[PDB]
Design a protein around this ligand. Structure first.
Ligand code: OLX
Ligand code: OLX
Lengths: 304, 304
């Protein structure tokens, strides 16, 4: 019993974190096999950040200008290339602690763990979600760029995010491990605003199922709804539209609890219209949307 | 910018988790040097749990009745002893991945990370706090016993908790690594009720300082208070009494923000009396009390 915001064990990713320094800029790198992946803005000064031409700035850099340190030992850089917004630094040593891994580009609403690092050293791990506007709400200070987001399936780490930026509003932006930003963001110190940060409806429903499984049932109402009626209310409350794909994904949670997906939708609709009335659900006074249906199944079943 | 519920990187603790089986019961163990620590109720059947006499049950057990597996390899048990509510299993091999470590008994209000495990395998990591009634609100399923709580200071892991029990209300109880339970709980399947779960006042204030540092300032009021006036309101709201020791501990956060501790107390007093009014602080609709002042300093400064 009990339901917590839980991150994946971070050991497999801690064994991959390195420090990358180019001139006077230092950030984090991800060492997998004989390649170190890092934000391409490691080559920039704070002045260059205002309007960088990365291809031009990279002409002035050779292999020996990238200092990669793993623990307290220096790695030899034998090649470098820019792929989208990441630099790939070929090193002469394969990372002995390289886990089984994949690079995945996640969809909005998907959750992942972030191992926040500074100078190639892990400081903490937390769980977050790719917002529908393609930002994440992380906890990142100067030097955190290059910190990665990931999911784990038994022994394989699927890297899905690398941190690159903080928008002027304090929210965060980054890329997949191929260097492609999530959303319309660019690695430039220019005013970039995020779109509407809607609530991830399918995740709120999954978390309502977790609440029922853990005994918080006060919010269960005597109503049902349809996808179209529910979505009219969801639109009004800045909730993402619910599709039949989302209903399908909640099927195992509906089966475990005996609560039809549309009945849970009607309970959510009443919570939106009436509010919490000073009550809590799983120790929260707001509806939590950073647990996917897969997260709820995993946590409630004890997947290791 | 941004403030998250963050756990310590778990790698150092993942390298210590083992599976301990005695007869038909399997739980987790913590392998440090040549000793494996685990809940003494690994020797019990579900029937024994109702009214166990551990000393008597242990007479029927020899070294070879404790099966310890680290990864997919069996460890040889060459000694066993009961210390309070934990068993210490001496093994013939020192754990090669033993980090620098200490065993600490924490005070209520102190936070720590839990690496939830099943069959000696890590499933997730989350941050929690020792409640003032000496329970924790974790996420633990059957077989999670033996999972540990810890804090890290650079390279030294201070183990503070081992999971032993779930109370009939869904809250959790356990011991320090010397086997002494936090609070009045016993390792027996008998109705045990928790006392008042008060709010950790000093932690709420630390989190209000984190909110100010991250730009959420709407709640800052034009008032001040005294410790005695504040405590009269805190008692009414089931908040822990604030002492001058707590004020001292908030000193660095008071200095960083320029907000006197007693002014923050008056802002908290107004939040308690007026409520949030549908507003949020750091994405929360309730006042968060599972960040200590040390956690706020660490996260806001980037300690690795
Ligand atoms: C990136 O290098 C970094 O560490 N940060 C700080 C952060 O808080 O995220 C940051 C902020 C902005 C930019 C512009 C692309 C880069 C970085
Ligand atoms: C302990 O062996 C365990 O794993 N659990 C399950 C839990 O959800 O915490 C448990 C519950 C009760 C007791 C009685 C002491 C032991 C354990």
């Amino acid at each position: 019993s009990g339901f917590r915001k839980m991150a994946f064990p971070s050991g497999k990713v801690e064994g991959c974190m390195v420090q990358v320094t180019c001139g006077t800029t230092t950030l984090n790198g991800l060492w997998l096999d004989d390649v170190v992946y890092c934000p391409r803005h490691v080559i920039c000064t704070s002045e260059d950040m205002l309007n960088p031409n990365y291809e031009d700035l990279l002409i002035r850099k050779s292999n020996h200008n990238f200092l990669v340190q793993a623990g307290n030992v220096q790695l030899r850089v034998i090649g470098h290339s820019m792929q989208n917004c990441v630099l790939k630094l070929k090193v002469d040593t394969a990372n002995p602690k390289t886990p089984k891994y994949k690079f995945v580009r996640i969809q909005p609403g998907q959750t992942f763990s972030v191992l926040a690092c500074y100078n190639g050293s892990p400081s903490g791990v937390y769980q977050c979600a790719m917002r529908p506007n393609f930002t994440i709400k992380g906890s990142f200070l100067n030097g955190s760029c290059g910190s990665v987001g990931f999911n784990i399936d038994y022994d394989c780490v699927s890297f899905c995010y690398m941190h690159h930026m903080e928008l002027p509003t304090g929210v965060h932006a980054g890329t997949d491990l191929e260097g492609n930003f999530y959303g319309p963001f660019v690695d430039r110190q220019t005013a970039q605003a995020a779109g509407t940060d809607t609530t991830i409806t399918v995740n709120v429903l999954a978390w309502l199922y977790a609440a029922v499984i853990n005994g918080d049932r006060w919010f269960l109402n005597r109503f049902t709804t349809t996808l179209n009626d529910f979505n009219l209310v969801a639109m009004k409350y800045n909730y993402e539209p619910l599709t039949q794909d989302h209903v399908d994904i909640l099927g195992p949670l509906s089966a475990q609890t005996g609560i039809a997906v549309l009945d849970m939708c009607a309970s959510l609709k009443e919570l939106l219209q009436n509010g919490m009335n000073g009550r809590t659900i799983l120790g929260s006074a707001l509806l939590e949307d950073e647990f996917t249906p897969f997260d709820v199944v995993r946590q409630c079943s004890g997947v290791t």
